[model samples]
Target chain A: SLREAFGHFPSGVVAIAAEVNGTLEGLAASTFVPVSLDPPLVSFCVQNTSTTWPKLKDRPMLGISVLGEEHDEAARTLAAKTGDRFAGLETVSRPTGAVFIKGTALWLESAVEQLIPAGDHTIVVLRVNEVTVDANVAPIV
Target chain B: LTASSLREAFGHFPSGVVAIAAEVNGTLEGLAASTFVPVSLDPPLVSFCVQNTSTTWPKLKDRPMLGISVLGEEHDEAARTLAAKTGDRFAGLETVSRPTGAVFIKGTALWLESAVEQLIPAGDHTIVVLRVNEVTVD
Candidate 1:
């Protein structure tokens, strides 16, 4: 299966979120790729059917935080939308309003750059405004 | 492919590291991309994204052909070398070059000759769409 074949390569997961409508709206994605350096770029793909996306877009700043290797449940929890999306997870916001998960591998302040429509999903390109890496933490796949 | 089928099928996604390099300005310039994706089969398409600050991208994007070398698990050092901020990325790896702009690392698990088709601007990054011209499984 194409899905299984794609699993051949390992990937680290990150939480991309922003405060919207007085609430934190975001999701966990593994398609995160560091694209460019001059303009400070990064990207990830999200399903087109995402309801969470519309809420996050049109915002000023967005946050991206890498999860540590031990955050498997956090990944699952962050990915699933239940009563409280961020129930047990802990996070903080930048002065710029980029929301980040605390204790994560790294934190990034980014802004929406462009969205390209592809089949079934939308490719999101982000411009990184600031970055803070925890030298001791390792990212999760 | 059915819309729902392809969508459902894509629910499964490993990301492997591939080195996309080409000879430009009389030197080998390239970068390591971990977001290599197999997009379609009908037109034989694939993609990888590049950062805006990447100096290597400027040198390689216009090449007629670019070599894609799939680094194996043993090539961690090579991957790091290729992903470096500066210095010669191909310093330690053995590479095979094509007259048509493509260059591959020797002993790579897989290699491909690709031509750039479209360069879409995405935020600070550019998603490069390529057509596969040839492949060799080593």
Candidate 2:
């Protein structure tokens, strides 16, 4: 019952991005959630066969962009068949080099600290770094 | 390559922000913002990011134990207040402080007890890893 009901409980869509030697990469995932707080932890499920994940797994840190309602198009871009996903997106790179979407009602910097293989997708755990929030936005869910 | 475009187009998704809190020296210290994320069922762990500049983080660090509160729709005011530079964020908010100094507010849909496990400085934020032990849901 809960598994089916979860569909009714909508969640915010997010695109996890990482860069290597100035090159950028990303993946869109709809199943992200809060897992722990003590160490400022978070996790998102990614498809097992996703090619994007393999590229990002080796990156030192990742930029997690939470897609706002206005981001519906951005999500579609990242989920696109090819070309550039960052084409229409506006983003800010942290002083440390990680990239996060700029106008995102809220933005956070995170580090990939742990990875666990769960079922069909891998659960990635990130440590929260810096956060910026705007009163104008609300949880997409 | 263009930072401005990346931030504008990608930052539209609204998210329910949350923070971790605990008590120290008879004072409540907290590390929070809108980065709460849910992860895993078999192990039941969750996560978020904290800025290194956080004043309260030093205190929370002395004691890795902390409390997690998922902001409710009505907690917008509270969230904004906590995000501010001054004033006691929890002055009027209803919260429960554990003996170890972890503080949790009532009305939150989820309350979690967690301990630190891993830390990685990725970019501007430090990725914290936590081992969740106890949790209460309303």
Candidate 3:
């Protein structure tokens, strides 16, 4: 099976969050990619059947947090059917409704612009609003 | 090849590929990438570059949110599907649905949770930045 082949390249994990009336919901993935420099842009993909995409899509702003080595549990919590993706995780909130993990290696503030379709997933184009990173930290896949 | 043409040629470099998919009125749309990179931390934003020649980008822009997925070594076919101009691209892929209605491949090497941030027009492609929420890794 080719399944074993895909594992050769592991990626850093990330969480996308948006505050809705003071609540946070997000999903996790390893496919985050950089798109541009001028006016800063990035993109990520989600399957066609994801329910989380709808809830956070309307937000004026979003929070992107790079998972640390200690974020394994947090990843599962978000993956579950739980209402709050931040439950049981240490986090900080931004004025723009962006949330960050306590030990996340990096965090970026962004706003939605477009959602494109390629296959079974949709390509979400975003504009970078702000950024912060822990140079001494490394992300956990 | 001319000196200028030889220097900026794109084949020698390897860029990470990603895909985003969302449902609008119960229909699916997605875009393939040859340029995906980690932007920065403090808030987690990621980015990808898409060619202007793509026919699917305009459709995905209409959605409020969508799912982001990374192609692994096994995703060569899926990448071709996403890169292709016509035909079914979902062949041989297992997709997982998120609560927000986004989708992810069931067995890809990495899965990134993202929301569209904004779109910037680059020379021949559009740069897409996203606020990353969560990720799943092998």
Candidate 4:
């Protein structure tokens, strides 16, 4: 299957989230890529049919949390299509609307830079505004 | 920490390595990218970002077809040599060339025969979108 082949490429899982409409709007992505250094840019690919990205895109800011080794449950919950996604998740949401998972290996405050439409997905380029990392944490692959 | 600050933060995320290569003129040219990403499944799409200053992409970007090899841990040096600073990227390697001019790294985890889709500029890099034409797992 196409997915099995694509999975050969190892990647870190991340949670893209924001506080939209006074609630958490988020999703997990395995396609995150670091684009540039001079300007501090990063990216993730979103499915064209995603219900989550649409709600989070217009926010003034977004959070990208590279999940840790123990975040298996968090990754599953965030990527699910339906549910009160944030019910038991512990997160820190800035007044600016960006929400970061408390213990991720890396966290970034970002904003949508551009959205390019591909076949059945959208390439989301993000301009990183701020960053923080926990050297002690191991990333979930 | 092996890295700190901007590079450190971004390095925490793991990503796959790929070699984009093709036969240009009478020689083989290509580059390695840790930025390889699978963009879509249906309609099959994928992409990688190249530094805007990259000299290799200029020659290979417009080609009708490109070969994308998802590298395995088997030959880590192949990834390094393919991304050689300047020319003659395939110094000593095992690869195959299709009739369409697409070239691939043999024994890689997988191979994708792709067509150039679009190129979008972003910051100091250019996003290259490729549409997968055929797939092979090895």
Best by lDDT: 4
Off by over 4 Å in 2: A1-43, A46-122, A125-141, B1-6, B25-27, B62-64, B73-75, B82-89, B99-101
Error of 1 at B116 (Å): 3.4
Which window of 10 residues has the lowest lDDT sum in candidate 1 chain B? B1-10
Predicted chain B of candidate 2, TM-score versus the true chain B: 0.74
What is each candidate's DockQ, to 2 decimals?
0.10, 0.10, 0.10, 0.36
lDDT of 1 by residue, A28-120 (tens): 665565554444566666677878778777789988775532136755555553225766777787667678876665676888876755567
Report the backbone clash tally of model 3.
Answer: 88
Candidate numbers, best lDDT first, in rank order: 4, 1, 3, 2
Model 3 spans with C-alpha error above 4 angstroms: A1-11, A68-84, A139-141, B1-120, B123-138
Best by TM-score: 4
Clashes in model 4: which pairs?
A: none
Instruction: Output the lDDT of residue B107, model 2.
Output: 73
Please compute and give the TM-score of the first chain of candidate 3 against the native first chain. 0.74
Candidate 4's DockQ: 0.36
| Model 1 Cα shift for residue A116 (angstroms) | 3.4
Residue A65 CA displacement from its true place in model 2, Å: 13
Docking class for model 3 is incorrect
User: If both were scored by TM-score, which would come out higher, candidate 1 or candidate 2?
Assistant: 1
lDDT of 1 at B115: 84
List fnat per candidate, in order. Answer: 0.07, 0.16, 0.19, 0.35
Interface RMSD, prediction 2: 8.0
Task: Point out the higher-scoring one by DockQ: 2 or 4.
Answer: 4
